[PDB]
Amino acid sequence: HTVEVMISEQEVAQRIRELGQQITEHYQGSSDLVLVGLLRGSFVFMADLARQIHLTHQVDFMTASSSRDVRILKDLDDDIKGKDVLLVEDIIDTGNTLNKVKEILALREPKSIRICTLLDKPTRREVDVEVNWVGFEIPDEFVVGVGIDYAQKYRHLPYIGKVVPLA
Amino acid sequence: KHTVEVMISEQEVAQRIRELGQQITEHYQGSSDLVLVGLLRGSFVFMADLARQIHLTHQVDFMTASSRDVRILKDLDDDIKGKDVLLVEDIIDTGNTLNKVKEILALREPKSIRICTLLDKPTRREVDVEVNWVGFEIPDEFVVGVGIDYAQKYRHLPYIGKVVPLA
Amino acid sequence: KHTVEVMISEQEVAQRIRELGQQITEHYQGSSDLVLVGLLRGSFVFMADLARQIHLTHQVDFMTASSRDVRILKDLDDDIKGKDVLLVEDIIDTGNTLNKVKEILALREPKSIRICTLLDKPTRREVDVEVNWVGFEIPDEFVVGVGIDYAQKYRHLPYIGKVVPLA
Amino acid sequence: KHTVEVMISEQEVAQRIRELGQQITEHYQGSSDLVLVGLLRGSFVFMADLARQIHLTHQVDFMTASRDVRILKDLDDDIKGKDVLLVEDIIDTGNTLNKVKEILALREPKSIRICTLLDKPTRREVDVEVNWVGFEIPDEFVVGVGIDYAQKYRHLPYIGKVVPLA
Q: What is the DSSP letter of D32?
């Protein structure tokens, strides 16, 4: 198999700059912003987005699992009561896991909860969940890069790639 | 300079847990999917004794909740979707943690959630949680034993004790 | 499908646990800091009964080790540096998991580490782990009860049972 | 009452990380079992930039470590027989990193090495071997590129110095 570039590193960077500007604008005057990354896949997008948000904010992470139940493998280290929470995803597809994570965090009485994802595969949606900011809407391909793995590989590519069969 | 007095004897505790087990057995008669979930660390002794008085095939699991936000330090190992869940507590006082744990688990769509505690301190409640089975209602004293610690000591006492000043 | 036969009766188990607790009490006499550490979920019932037969003030804590690498899904809540640590197991068969848990804990520089188990299957051993206190040494049978499950069932049986396939 | 001063610019950080990724790429050449392991939360930004400058196929994982050094979140995947690179935002006393290394050594990786974006050598309390270092600094009050003050400023793109104004 091989990887072709689907979304270039610079196209990704420009889109994250735009998301950063929109998010900065939306939260202007808030000192309670916290970005929460869903591990492992969101960490690259999160790193780049945080650096494009010109507001003082905090960072946290959750690891949610998958058989049926959405379980918390690692919860947040910090409180979110009365805070503005931004969930940060690498890719939203079925929306299952994200939906339960949002509901679990809603119980803690944050000031607000929103969601931003680098990629959205809306044709995979099985439970709808409100996504405030989306980097790129894509079809249901095997994508990798910018934090996203194929068999644990390729998270470290600076571009969004597509895994394709060779010769 | 402090000591432990017996408040509820080893045998009084055992008789009560025998009675709870009988009522719980009757209650879930014909459920194919009973699961007891303890809250660690305090629940484990009461859980062990109670599970042995329940004359139904059932599963056991544990959560560790945190102690401002209620966070999940260690989640269930198994699924509870469509199951009858019995939350098992050593003591309910403010009700804050238990309430949030119930709300977290309710998101998983168990068939039912009910709650059983060995000790209840009703005068300490800060939030409404409905508890179907209560071993003993007690005044707000420093109690220890049957899983309950004081500064981590005395969980291993077979009786419910009360910590008292000496001299 | 199957039935369960009594292999070691409730009373036999209670008597042996009392013997072990007595020996453990003698062994750590004069120790200021005993901590019993159970591996979840299997060890919780044995732990509850055993701690109640140990007549020294002590602490209780728990770990959850993964089911190749032995990973820590839930670590101890409390420190063990300088303490006498007693690892508590429902059953020891291959010894692989328990060996790693011991090495992991030794890095924290406890004063000592010893191991107790309710059941021991010495024929299944794959690594050398020395076990000072053994409730019952048994053949490689499918056992359940007193914390031990089969397909998550039967942890709540008050005896050690043998699972027996039928027709 | 404070501000933050730029101590090491975004561009200096970027160039140094590229140099580190190059050295790392060269060192691990021919190995197909590279895994970078960051310690949360501080390492995630340096990790993200470093991984993208490493031109070898590799895996990425995370641990979060807590007197006793405890494991609050372990790795998700096996490291037996692998080349492990622990990735750190800053190394000061070394105490946590030393124990994490010891813990992972029990799993029999083929090798374990350590990289840090910042190193404070005069702060060292335990000896631990640090293989790659982005910037060796004095004991300044630092933030940015993953590093916080009171949970704030991990999002700054440069290494900043917190300068009390109070």
A: S
The 10 Å Cβ neighbour count of residue A17 is: 14
Verify whether the Cβ–Cβ distance A59 to D155 is below 8 Å. Answer: yes
The DSSP H or E segment spanning D82 is none
Dig out the tokens for B141 from the structure.
């004293």
Please give the residue of chain C at the shortest CA–CA distance from D73: C73
Cα distances (angstroms) measured from residue B85 to each of B33, B110, B130? 8, 7, 14
Distance CA C164, CA C4 (A): 6
Burial class (CB in 10 A: 0-12, 13-18, 19+), A67: exposed
Distance CA C98, CA B152 (A): 24
CB B47 within 8 A of CB B35: no
Structure resolution, Å: 2.0
For C164, the token pair is 């027996």
Sheet strands (E) in chain A: 2-7, 33-38, 58-65, 71-74, 84-92, 112-120, 133-137, 143-144, 160-164
Task: From chain D, pick out residues whose CB is under 8 angstroms from the CB of C80.
Answer: 68
For chain B, the domains span 1-167
Determine the CATH number of domain D1-166. Answer: 3.40.50.2020
- Fold annotation for B1-167: Rossmann fold (3.40.50)
Q: Is A93 a catalytic residue?
A: yes
Helix (H) / strand (E) element for C72: namely: strand C72-74
Distance (Å, whole) CA B76 – CA D122: 44
Give the separation between CA B34 and CA B30, rounded to whole angstroms: 10
